[PDB]
Amino acid sequence: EICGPGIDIRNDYQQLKRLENCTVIEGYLHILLISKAEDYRSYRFPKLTVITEYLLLFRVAGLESLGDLFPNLTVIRGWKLFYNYALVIFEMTNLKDIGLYNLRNITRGAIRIEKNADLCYLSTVDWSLILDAVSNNYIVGNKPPKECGDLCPGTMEEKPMCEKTTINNEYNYRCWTTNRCQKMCPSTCGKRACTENNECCHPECLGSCSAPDNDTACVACRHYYYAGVCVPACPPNTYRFEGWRCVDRDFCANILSEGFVIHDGECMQECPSGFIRNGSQSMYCIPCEGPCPKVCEEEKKTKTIDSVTSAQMLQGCTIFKGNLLINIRRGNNIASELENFMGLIEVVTGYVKIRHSHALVSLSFLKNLRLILGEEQLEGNYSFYVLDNQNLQQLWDWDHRNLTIKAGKMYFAFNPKLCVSEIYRMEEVTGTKGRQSKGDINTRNNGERASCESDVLHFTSTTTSKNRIIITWHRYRPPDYRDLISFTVYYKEAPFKNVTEYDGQDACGSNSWNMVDVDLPPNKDVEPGILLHGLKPWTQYAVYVKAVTLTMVENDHIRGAKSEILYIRTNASVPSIPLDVLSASNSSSQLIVKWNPPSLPNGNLSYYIVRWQRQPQDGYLYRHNYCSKDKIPIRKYADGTIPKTEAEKQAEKEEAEYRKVFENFLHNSIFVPRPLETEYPFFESRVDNKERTVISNLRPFTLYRIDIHSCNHEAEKLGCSASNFVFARTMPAEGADDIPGPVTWEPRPENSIFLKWPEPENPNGLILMYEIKYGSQVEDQRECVSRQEYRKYGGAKLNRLNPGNYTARIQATSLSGNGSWTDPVFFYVQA
Amino acid sequence: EICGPGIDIRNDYQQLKRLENCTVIEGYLHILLISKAEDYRSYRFPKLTVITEYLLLFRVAGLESLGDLFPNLTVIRGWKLFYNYALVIFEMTNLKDIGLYNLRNITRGAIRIEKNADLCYLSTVDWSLILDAVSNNYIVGNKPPKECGDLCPGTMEEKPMCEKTTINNEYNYRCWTTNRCQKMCPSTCGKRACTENNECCHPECLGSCSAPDNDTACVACRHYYYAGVCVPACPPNTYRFEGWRCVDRDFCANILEGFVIHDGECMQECPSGFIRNGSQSMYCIPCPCPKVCEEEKKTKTIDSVTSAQMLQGCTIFKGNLLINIRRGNNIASELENFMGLIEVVTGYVKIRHSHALVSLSFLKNLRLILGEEQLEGNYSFYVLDNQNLQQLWDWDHRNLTIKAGKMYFAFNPKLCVSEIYRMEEVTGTKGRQSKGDINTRNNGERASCESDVLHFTSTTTSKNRIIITWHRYRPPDYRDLISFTVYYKEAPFKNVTEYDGQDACGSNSWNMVDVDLPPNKDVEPGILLHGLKPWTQYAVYVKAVTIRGAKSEILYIRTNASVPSIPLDVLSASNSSSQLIVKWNPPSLPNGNLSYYIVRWQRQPQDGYLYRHNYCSKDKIPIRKTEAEKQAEKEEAEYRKVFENFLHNSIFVPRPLETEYPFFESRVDNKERTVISNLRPFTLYRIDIHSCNHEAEKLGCSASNFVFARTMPAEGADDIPGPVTWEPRPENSIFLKWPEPENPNGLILMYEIKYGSQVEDQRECVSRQEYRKYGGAKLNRLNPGNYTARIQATSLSGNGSWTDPVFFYVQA
Amino acid sequence: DKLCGKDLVDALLLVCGEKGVYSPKMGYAGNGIADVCCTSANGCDLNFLEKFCKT
Ligand SMILES: *[C@@H]1O[C@H](CO)[C@@H](O[C@@H]2O[C@H](CO)[C@@H](O[C@@H]3O[C@H](CO)[C@@H](O)[C@H](O)[C@@H]3O)[C@H](O)[C@H]2NC(C)=O)[C@H](O)[C@H]1NC(C)=O
Ligand SMILES: *[C@@H]1O[C@H](CO)[C@@H](O[C@@H]2O[C@H](CO)[C@@H](O)[C@H](O)[C@H]2NC(C)=O)[C@H](O)[C@H]1NC(C)=O
Ligand SMILES: *[C@@H]1O[C@H](CO)[C@@H](O[C@@H]2O[C@H](CO)[C@@H](O)[C@H](O)[C@H]2NC(C)=O)[C@H](O)[C@H]1NC(C)=O
Ligand SMILES: *[C@@H]1O[C@H](CO)[C@@H](O)[C@H](O)[C@H]1NC(C)=O
Ligand SMILES: *[C@@H]1O[C@H](CO)[C@@H](O)[C@H](O)[C@H]1NC(C)=O
Ligand SMILES: *[C@@H]1O[C@H](CO)[C@@H](O)[C@H](O)[C@H]1NC(C)=O
Ligand SMILES: *[C@@H]1O[C@H](CO)[C@@H](O)[C@H](O)[C@H]1NC(C)=O
Ligand SMILES: *[C@@H]1O[C@H](CO)[C@@H](O)[C@H](O)[C@H]1NC(C)=O
Ligand SMILES: *[C@@H]1O[C@H](CO)[C@@H](O)[C@H](O)[C@H]1NC(C)=O
Ligand SMILES: *[C@@H]1O[C@H](CO)[C@@H](O)[C@H](O)[C@H]1NC(C)=O
Ligand SMILES: *[C@@H]1O[C@H](CO)[C@@H](O)[C@H](O)[C@H]1NC(C)=O
Ligand SMILES: *[C@@H]1O[C@H](CO)[C@@H](O)[C@H](O)[C@H]1NC(C)=O
Ligand SMILES: *[C@@H]1O[C@H](CO)[C@@H](O)[C@H](O)[C@H]1NC(C)=O
Ligand SMILES: *[C@@H]1O[C@H](CO)[C@@H](O)[C@H](O)[C@H]1NC(C)=O
C-alpha cells in the first residue's frame, strides 16, 4: 500500500517495521538516532519504490548500506525538500556506501551527504544522470576520497560490469556499492527510462520498467500515476495529488485535516495564494480580490502582543475581529518580523493600543492596516492609543498609506521621539480631524526630544564605480555653526525605490542600514562628502544623510537636517566567474557544458562566452612508466596537537556642547564694548539566455579546457569576465583502442618469445599501458608493457617460457580505459 | 612689585612688557589675541611667582612655550575662577608645550587646555601633584596624541634626567617640556612644599624654596602671606585680603567706598545681616539686613563655580536660577559654599541638563522660590533632563515654599517619584500640578528607592521553565487590578542591579513579562517564565503597576539541569603509538556544572575492502555583510539547529578475520583534554565525547560528538620480524617466505620484492590475498645465476624498512 | 547673520585688526558678544563689531 504522511523512525530498528507494507511514501521518511540492534541483515523493505519528499538519515548506527534498507527505492521525487536537499545522510556511522542501487531519477533537490566517516562510493555515483542540479550537492566530509578504494563490481575480478560516463575530466565506472553498478539506459532510449534488460520504458514512465512501452509496468511515473497507468496529466475525472498521483474528488473529500481543496486540477491541504474556498467547508476555490480575507478572531477581546513571537498567532491575517495591545520591548529584529506576522492585517475591528513599546521606531510594520473600526473602544472612547513609547518616531509613511478610523478618538502621550506634526498628519488622513481635543494631543510630552523640523541636505555631486560611491552635499551650517558635530550617511542595498528611513532602525543599536560618519570639513571651501566602498556593482543603494546636532537652545530651535533618499545604482562591472561549470560528453566529438549564473550579476546578463581549447597530454603521462606500482593509499594518523558606539557618539556630542558653552563664556567674558607539446587553437562561441551549450566537432577522448565568461551590456567596454573554467573530457570512441591489426609472435633465443602488435590509429588519449595475458590452455600468467617500452621496441618479450601450446592475448589501456582484448595468438617454445 | 586688581595683556606683545617687574598678580592674568608675533616676540619674565585668581591665554600668536614667558610662575591660587578653571590655554597657535615647569601648585581650580593644535606635552604633566581636583580637568581639545609620547628629558638626553609616576593606572615619565621635568619630591615631604635641593621646606609652605628650610623664603605661601613670612592665620592685628595675604589696615583703607573689615577678612561689602557702622564707618555691625543680589539678565545661568560665585554671600536673589551644571564633578561643595546662603529665589528655579547634581541639597538654607517670574507654562520650579538627580532636598529637615507658579518634573531617571510627591507635601504645591507636569513615566525610571515589599510565595522549576508566585498585594485604596510585571534576566553572578538602567537593549538586559492579578482571589498571581536556557541563573523581581510601591527582592532562581549539548569542536592527535590525545571545548550549552566528561572509544575494523582489493592490480592515477550573505548564513544556521534539536533529545546512560570490538570508557573531570592509552597501533578509534553534568545520575550524559582518530604507526612494528627464507622451485623459479609482522600498522596491504643479480633492478608485487595463501611469494621464471633480493612490507601507514637481503641462486 | 565660534573671533579680528580689542578696568565696580552676535536671535552686525574694538 501507499504510506504516509511523514514517516519518522527515531529510536530503534524495531520501529523500522512500519515500512514493510509501503511501496510509495507520501512523506519524507526520516530515520534518526537508531541504536544498533544486532539483528544485522534483518529489516529490509524491498516493497518501497518511491519516496515523494526526501529521505533523511541521521546517526543511524550499524546501518552499513541503505541498499539493505531500500533495495528497490527508485525515485525520490523531492516534492518537499529538506532545506533544498532530497537525500540527506548526516553523521551516519558504519555507513560504507549509499547503496541505493535502484535509485534512478531524483526529480528535485540536491544530495547533501555530510560527515559520514566511513562513507565511500560517493564519487562513483554520476549524480548528473540521477539529478538535474549536481552543483547544489554539498558532499562535504565523509571518508576522504584518497582512502576509499571505491572499487566497482568486476574491477577486482578484471571483469568490470558497469557503465562509464564523463564528469568533467574524470571518466571511470559508476557504482552505488562494491557489488552493484549504477543502472544507466542506452543512448537509444533518449530521455526515457528503461527496464533492466535495456528495453526502453514508456515515455511517461520514470526510473524503471517491468515491461517496455507499457504504461502499467512502471515502478515510478514522471508526471502522474492513476490506477497503475502513468499519465502525463490526470484524466479529467481525477485530480493531481501530492505531486505523484491522480485521486478522485471522492478520495480528496475523505482525507483528514476544513478538508482538502481542488484547484487548477490539483488537490491541496489549503487553497494557495490568491484563492479561497467557495464557502464554509467546500472543496472548490475562487480567486480573491486582494489577499484572501481571513478573520482572525480570539476569545480574549484584547490580544496582547508583548514579544516578537507573541504576534505569531496572527501568522497572516486580514480582519482581526478583536482589539490589539502592542507591547513590544527588546528583540532587535522587531519591525522586520512584526511585519511578517501582522503586515497583512487590513482591518482591526476593535481598538489598537501601542503601550510601553520601547522597541518600535515606526508602526509601518502594520503595512496594510486600512481600517480601525473602533466598534469596541478602550476607555473615554479611545480607539487608537499610544502611550509611553521611548523610541517611537513614525506612525506610518503618510505619503503612501491611507489608514482610517471609523469610530473613537485618537490618543498620544509620552512619545519623546514621535513628532506632533506626524501625529497631526495621521489625524489628517485617518478621518479623525475632530474627534479628540486638548488633553488627548497634549503636545507637552509628544516630540519633546524629537527633531521635528529639518532643512534639506541637497546632494551636490555623485560619482560611482564598480565598488564605490563618492557623494557630496551642500555646505550646512545651523545658526550656531558649532552645534553641527558630524553628518551620518546611511546606505543600504535597495533594489526597489520604496525604502524610507525607518526600514528597520528599531532601538537596538545597529540596524538594517549600514552607516558611516563624515566630520565637518576643516577647509571652509571643501564640501562635505563620503567615499562609500565595499559596495556591489550594478546594485541600487538607498543613500541619505542626516545632520548630527546638539539641542542646547531647545524650544525646537535645533533644526536637524535630512537629505532626500537618493537611489544610486553603482556602475555595471565585469561579471564574477560563472559558478560551477560542469560538463558531460554524451558522445565522442561532443560535450554538453552546463553552468550556473555568476555569483554576482554585475549587470544585465546578455550572454556567455564559452571558449574551448585542447590541452597537451605529454607533460604528466608520457614518461610515467605506468607498468610500475603507484603510491599505495597510505592513511594519515591524527595530527594537530594544541562602528562607533552610541555611547561614543553621545560622548562626542556632550564634549561638543561643553566646548560650545565654554567658547560662549570665553567670548562673553573677554570681549567688552567700548563705552609533443603544442598550443592548440582557441574556439569561441556566444550563448544567449541559456546556461548550457553543446560544443561539437571535437576529438575522441581529448582534454578541452573550457573557459566561460559571463557578459552584460558593458561587455564591449570592460570585456566579459574572469574565466571560470572546467577541464572537460570528451567521451571515448568505441573500439578506437582495440588493436587495428593482427598481432604476430616471433622467436627469441633460449626459452623466451617476442610478441608484436600495431599502435591504435586514434587512441582515446595516450595508450599508457599494454597488458599481455599468456599461458598454455589457460592464461595463467600476466605481464604488462609501459608506453615507453612500446615506443622503444614495438612489441615486448616474454621471458623463459616452457614448451607447449602457449597462447597470448593483448589489451591496450588508454587514458580512457582498457580496449577490447585482441584475438588470441598461438605460439610454442622449442626444445 | 605686587600687581592688581587684574591684568588684561591684550593685542600687543609690546603690552606684554607690563609684567617686567610684577611678582604676584593679585587677580587674573589675561594674555589675549596678540597677533604681532614675528614683529616683536622676545619676552621673558623671571620675576613672576604667584597668580591669585587665574591665568587665561586666548589666541596668542607664535608663542612656542610659556616656558619663555613665565619660567618661575610657581602657584595659581584660584581664589576667583574662570568657569571652574584656574588655568585656561585656548586656541593658541604653535604652542608646542605648556612649559610652566616651576608651577608646583594650583589651588582650588581645574585646568582646561583646549584647541592648541600644536601642543605636544599636555599628557606628560602629573596634575595629581599640582591640584587635588584632577577629576575636573578638561584637556580634551588637545593636539592629536599621535606624536607626543616619551618626549621627556627621561629619554631626550640619551638617558633620564627625569622621574616617572602613575596616572589612573598608566605609568609614564613626567615633564612639562624638553630640558625640564616636573618638580616632585619624596614621600617624606608628601604633604609639604619640597625644595630645589630636595629638602622638605616649611610646614606652612606651598611653592618652592631655594634654601632647604629657610622660612621666609617660600616662593608661595600656603594659607596667607604677610610681610615676607607665611602664616596659618593672619596675625592678630592684620586682616585677610584677596584670599592670599594679610594686610595691616592702611592698605584695605586705601583701595579705591573702600573695603570693609569683618570676620578677620577684607571684602567689598559687609556680608548678609551686616551694615557698616555709624561714626566708625569702616567696620561691619549686625543690623538683620538681607543682602539682595541681582543681574542685568533677569535669568542667571549657573553652569560653573564662577557663575555661582557671583552670588557668594547673597541671601535673596532677584531673578531666576537656571541651574545648568553639566560636568562639575564634586563642585556641589563649591555651589554650597556660594549659594548655600540664598534663602529666597524671587523668580523661578530651572534645573535643566544639570547632570552633575546628584542632589539639590547644595541649595542650603533655601526657603522660598517665589515665582514672581515664571516660565512658559506658568512654571516656577522646572526640573528637566537631570540624569543623576536623586533628591530635591525636601527630606524631613527643611520646608520650601513656592508662593506662585507650578512645578514640572521630566526625565529625571534616578529621582524617586516619592520625592517629587513629597515635595508637593513639603512645599504645599499640592493644588498646582497636573499629571502631565509630574510624570510617573520619566521620573523614577531608574535607581528608585523603595518601601513596599512583594514576597515570593512559591517557585517551581523545570529544564526550560520557571514558575513564580507572589502575594496578592493591595493597599487600603482598592483602586485597580494591580498589574504585576516580572523582570527576568540571565544573572551569571548575583551582582545584579534592578532595572535601574537606561539600557533598553544590549547583550543581557532585563526582560519584562507583564502579568495581571487574576480575578480569583484564592490564586496567588504567577508567571510561567519560558524560553529560559537550562541551568542558567535568572534574576527575577516582581513589580507593581498603577501613590504606590510593591517591588520584590531579586530572586536568583536557577532552572533545572538538562542533558548537555554536544562537546563542541572535538579534535585529536597521536604523539605515540598505543596512545591518543583528544581535545574539545565546553559544550554550546553546559546545561549544568560540567562535573565530568565521559570519553568512550572503540576500535573501528580495518576497512573491509583492504582485505579484498588485491593491491598488486593496476590503477591509472589521472590528475589535471549584505542581505544575501546574511541569508545564506541564517539558512546554514537553521540547518544546524534542526540536527541539534534532533540529538539534544537523545541521552546516553553511563555504565553502572576481524568483525567487531568492545567499547572502552573513562570519566575525565579536570579539563577539556584527555590522554587515551593502551590502544592498538595505528588503529582508527571512534572517540565519542559525552559531555556530562552533576545531574547525570538522573538524566545521563550528552549524545556523543564523535571524532575518528587514528593512532600513529609504531615504527619498527610493520617491518618483517625476522630473516627472509628462500627455496628453489621447479622451472627456474624461487620462493621467498617471510613471517607476517606480529602487530602491523593497520594491515599489510602488499609486499614489494626487489630482486636482481647484482642490483635490485627488477621489482615484484605480492598482495596480502596471495601472501595469506602461500606464506610468501613465488619469484617465477628468473634467469639462472647468482641473485640478491630484499622485501619491503607496505602497511596501511607506509613502508617497512627493506629487510636483510637474501642471496639465493638459480641453477641452469 | 550670526557669528558664533571661530567665525566670531575671526570676524572681530578682521574688524579691529590693528585698532585692537577693548578692556574693562571697571575699578572694582552685559549679555556679551557671544549673545548679541550668536546665542540670541539678534544676529551679528559688521557695524556693531566695531563697538568691541579699542578706540
Ligand atoms: C528526473 O525526472 C524529472 C521528471 O520526473 C526530469 O525532468 C525534470 O523535471 C523537473 C520537475 O521537478 C523539471 O523542473 C521544473 O519543475 C517545476 C515544478 O517544480 C516546473 O514549474 C518547471 O517548469 C520545470 O518543469 C525539469 O525541467 C525537468 N527537466 C527536464 C530536462 O525535462 C529530470 O530530468 C530527471 N532527472 C534526470 C537527471 O534526468
Ligand atoms: C596644593 O595646594 C592646595 C592649597 O593648600 C592644597 O589643597 C587643599 O587646600 C585646602 C585649603 O588650603 C586645604 O584645606 C586642603 O587640606 C588641601 N588639600 C589637601 C589634600 O591637603 C593641595 O593639597 C596642594 N597640593 C596639590 C597636589 O594640590
Ligand atoms: C605522549 O603524550 C602523552 C600525553 O601528554 C604523554 O602521556 C602522559 O601525559 C600526561 C599529560 O600530559 C603527563 O602528565 C604524563 O607525565 C605523561 N606520561 C608520561 C609517562 O610522562 C606521553 O608521555 C607522551 N609520549 C609517549 C611516548 O607516549
Ligand atoms: C501489513 O498488512 C497486514 C495485512 O496485509 C497487517 O496484518 C499488518 O499489521 C500490516 N503491517 C503494517 C506495519 O502496516
Ligand atoms: C463612546 O461615546 C458615546 C457618546 O459619548 C458613549 O455613549 C459611549 O459609552 C462611549 N463608549 C463606547 C465604547 O461606545
Ligand atoms: C490615498 O488617498 C489619496 C486621496 O484620494 C490619494 O491621493 C492616494 O493615492 C491614496 N493612496 C492609496 C495608497 O490609496
Ligand atoms: C518595497 O517593495 C519591495 C518589493 O517586493 C518589498 O519587498 C518591500 O517590502 C517594499 N517596501 C520597502 C520599504 O522596501
Ligand atoms: C558609471 O556610470 C556613469 C553613468 O552616468 C558614467 O557616466 C560613468 O562613466 C561610469 N563610470 C565607470 C567607471 O564606469
Ligand atoms: C548529445 O546531446 C545533444 C543535445 O544535448 C544532441 O543534440 C546530440 O545529438 C547528442 N548526441 C548524441 C550522440 O546523442
Ligand atoms: C535590465 O533587466 C531588467 C529586468 O529584466 C529590466 O527591467 C531593465 O529594463 C533592464 N535594463 C537594461 C538597461 O537592459
Ligand atoms: C619696573 O622698574 C622700573 C625701574 O627701571 C620702574 O621705573 C618701573 O616703574 C617698574 N615697573 C614697570 C611696570 O615698569
Ligand atoms: C631666612 O633667610 C633670611 C635672610 O638671611 C633670615 O633673616 C631668616 O632668619 C631665615 N629664616 C630662618 C628660619 O632662619
Ligand atoms: C559581576 O562579577 C563578575 C565577576 O567575574 C564580573 O565579571 C562582572 O562584570 C560583574 N558585574 C557587575 C554588573 O558588576
Ligand atoms: C556548581 O559550581 C558552582 C561554582 O561555579 C558551585 O558553587 C556549586 O555548588 C556547583 N553545584 C553543583 C551541583 O555542582
Q: How far apart are CA B233 and CA B240, in angstroms?
A: 8
| CA distances, A73 to each of A51, A54, A76, A103, B55 (Å) | 7, 12, 8, 6, 94
Q: Put the strands of the sheet holding B762-767 in their side by side order.
A: B762-767, B748-756, B788-795
Nearest-CA neighbor of B358 among B382, B328, B391?
B391
Cell of B2: 605686587
Q: How far apart are CA B464 and CA A657, in angstroms?
A: 48
The answer to whether B551 and B541 have CB atoms below 8 angstroms apart is: yes
**Ligand 3 centroid from CA B573, angstroms:** 13
Question: Among A604, A714, A717, which is best to mutate for testing ligand 10, by the most ligand atoms less than 8 A from CB?
Answer: A604
- Looking at chain C, the residues that come just before a C–N gap of over 2.5 A are 29
Q: Which residue of B has its CA nearest to A657?
A: B326
Q: Which of B604, B609, B713 sits opposite A149 (nearest CB)?
A: B609
Query: A512-515, long-range: CB within 8 Å, 24+ apart, which pairs?
Result: A512/A336, A514/A490, A515/A488, A515/A489, A515/A490, A515/A491
Q: Which atom of ligand 8 is nearest to the CA of A465?
A: 13
The answer to whether A593 and A728 have CB atoms below 8 angstroms apart is: yes
Tell me whether C11 touches chain A (CB under 8 Å): no
Q: Which of B514, B574, B614 sits opposite A637 (nearest CB)?
A: B574
Q: How far apart are CA B606 and CA A635, in angstroms?
A: 11
The answer to whether A760 and A812 have CB atoms below 8 angstroms apart is: yes
* Residue A464 Cβ < 6 Å to ligand 8: yes
Query: C46: alpha, beta or left, given left = phi > 0 and alpha = psi -120 to 50?
Result: alpha
Q: Do A671 and C55 touch (CB under 8 A)?
A: no
Q: How far apart are CA A181 and CA A160, in angstroms?
A: 10
The answer to whether B514 and A306 have CB atoms below 8 angstroms apart is: yes
Q: How far apart are CA A29 and CA A31, in angstroms?
A: 6
**Ligand 1 centroid from CA A107, angstroms:** 6
Nearest-CA neighbor of A37 among A94, A85, A75, A86?
A94
The answer to whether A84 and A101 have CB atoms below 8 angstroms apart is: no
Nearest CA to ligand 5 atom 11: A381
The number of folded domains in chain C is: 1
- Those residues with Cβ within 8 angstroms of residue B376's Cβ, 6 or more apart along the chain or in another chain: none
Residue C28 lies in a domain: yes
Cell of B256: 579705591
Solved by what technique?
A: cryo-EM
| CA distances, A671 to each of A119, A458, B18, B27, C44 (Å) | 87, 37, 20, 18, 14
Q: Put the strands of the sheet holding B555-558 in their side by side order.
A: B511-516, B483-490, B537-544, B555-558
Percentage helix, strand, coil for chain B under 3-state DSSP, each rounded to 5:
10, 30, 55
Q: Which residue of A has its CA nearest to B513?
A: A306
Q: Which of C20, C27, C30 sits opposite B296 (nearest CB)?
A: C30
Q: How far apart are CA B239 and CA B603, in angstroms?
A: 100
Which residues of chain C neighbour A478 with C-beta distances below 8 Å? none
Angle (CA) B786-B791-B794 rounded to 5° is: 160
φ/ψ (deg, to 5) at A283? -80, -30
Across-strand partners of B516? B483
Q: What does R_g of chain A's alpha carbons equal in angstroms? A: 37
- Those residues with Cβ within 8 angstroms of residue A396's Cβ, 6 or more apart along the chain or in another chain: A362, A363, A364, A366, A369, A403, A426
φ/ψ (deg, to 5) at A387? -145, 130
- Those residues with Cβ within 8 angstroms of residue A142's Cβ, 6 or more apart along the chain or in another chain: A113, A114, A115, A116, A117, A119, A120, A122
Q: How far apart are CA A599 and CA B739, in angstroms?
A: 59
Count interface pairs A-B at CB distance under 8 A: 182
* Residue B295 Cβ < 6 Å to ligand 12: no
- Those residues with Cβ within 8 angstroms of residue A157's Cβ, 6 or more apart along the chain or in another chain: none
B354-369: burial string, b at 16+ Cβ within 10 Å, e else: bbbbeebbbbeebebb
| Single-letter code of the amino acid located at A357 | S
Strands (DSSP E) along B411-522, which ranges? Answer: 453-454, 456-461, 465-470, 483-490, 511-516
Q: Which of B442, B514, B713 sits opposite A327 (nearest CB)?
A: B514
Which residues of chain A neighbour B643 with C-beta distances below 8 Å? 58, 90-91
The answer to whether A366 and A397 have CB atoms below 8 angstroms apart is: no
Three-state SS at A643: coil
Tell me whether C28 touches chain B (CB under 8 Å): yes
Nearest-CA neighbor of B109 among B353, B303, B300, B306?
B306
Three-state SS at A786: strand
Q: How far apart are CA A416 and CA A450, in angstroms?
A: 6
Q: Which atom of ligand 3 is nearest to the CA of B581?
A: 4
Across-strand partners of A786? A769
Question: Among A132, A586, A588, which is best to mutate for testing ligand 9, by the most ligand atoms less than 8 A from CB?
Answer: A586
The answer to whether B538 and B559 have CB atoms below 8 angstroms apart is: yes
- Lining residues, ligand 5, CB within 6 Å: A 377, 381
Question: Among A467, A469, A571, A712, which is best to mutate for testing ligand 8, by the most ligand atoms less than 8 A from CB?
Answer: A571
Residue C37 lies in a domain: yes
Note the Cα A715 to chain centre separation in Å: 28
Q: How far apart are CA B224 and CA B161, in angstroms?
A: 34
Which residues of chain C neighbour B295 with C-beta distances below 8 Å? 30
Which residues of chain C neighbour B296 with C-beta distances below 8 Å? 30-31
| CA distances, A714 to each of A573, A575, B267 (Å) | 7, 10, 86
Nearest-CA neighbor of B545 among B573, B511, B565, B516?
B516
- Those residues with Cβ within 8 angstroms of residue A577's Cβ, 6 or more apart along the chain or in another chain: A598, A599, A708, A710, A721, A722, A723, A724
Angle (CA) A52-A57-A58 rounded to 5° is: 150
Cell of A527: 564640501
Across-strand partners of A381? none
Q: How far apart are CA B143 and CA A281, in angstroms?
A: 78
Residue C1 lies in a domain: no
Q: How far apart are CA B212 and CA B193, in angstroms?
A: 11
Q: How far apart are CA B406 and CA B436, in angstroms?
A: 12
**Ligand 1 centroid from CA A79, angstroms:** 11
Q: Which residue of B has its CA nearest to A360?
A: B504
- Closest ligand to the CA of A400: 6
The answer to whether B699 and B611 have CB atoms below 8 angstroms apart is: no
The answer to whether B620 and B591 have CB atoms below 8 angstroms apart is: no
In the block, residue with C-alpha cell 565546553: B586
| CA distances, B670 to each of A181, A775, B565, B597, B784 (Å) | 51, 68, 18, 9, 68
Which residues of chain C neighbour B268 with C-beta distances below 8 Å? 28-29
| CA distances, B260 to each of A778, B192, B288, B312, B498 (Å) | 140, 34, 18, 16, 56
Strands (DSSP E) along A115-174, which ranges? Answer: 164-167, 170-173
- Lining residues, ligand 7, CB within 6 Å: A 496, 498-500, 503
Residue C39 lies in a domain: yes
Q: How far apart are CA A207 and CA A130, in angstroms?
A: 9
Which residues of chain C neighbour A523 with C-beta distances below 8 Å? none
Which residues of chain A neighbour B439 with C-beta distances below 8 Å? 414, 445
Q: Do A480 and C22 touch (CB under 8 A)?
A: no
Q: Which atom of ligand 13 is nearest to the CA of B495?
A: 1
Cell of B36: 604681532
The answer to whether B619 and A630 have CB atoms below 8 angstroms apart is: yes
Domain range enclosing C45: 6-52
- Lining residues, ligand 11, CB within 6 Å: B 1, 18, 20-21
Cell of A388: 509611553
| Mutation site, B11, B18, B59, B296, interface C, largest C CB count within 10 A | B11
Q: How far apart are CA B737 and CA B739, in angstroms?
A: 7
B752-790: burial string, b at 16+ Cβ within 10 Å, e else: bbbbeeeebeeebbbbbebbeeeebbbbbbbeeeebebb
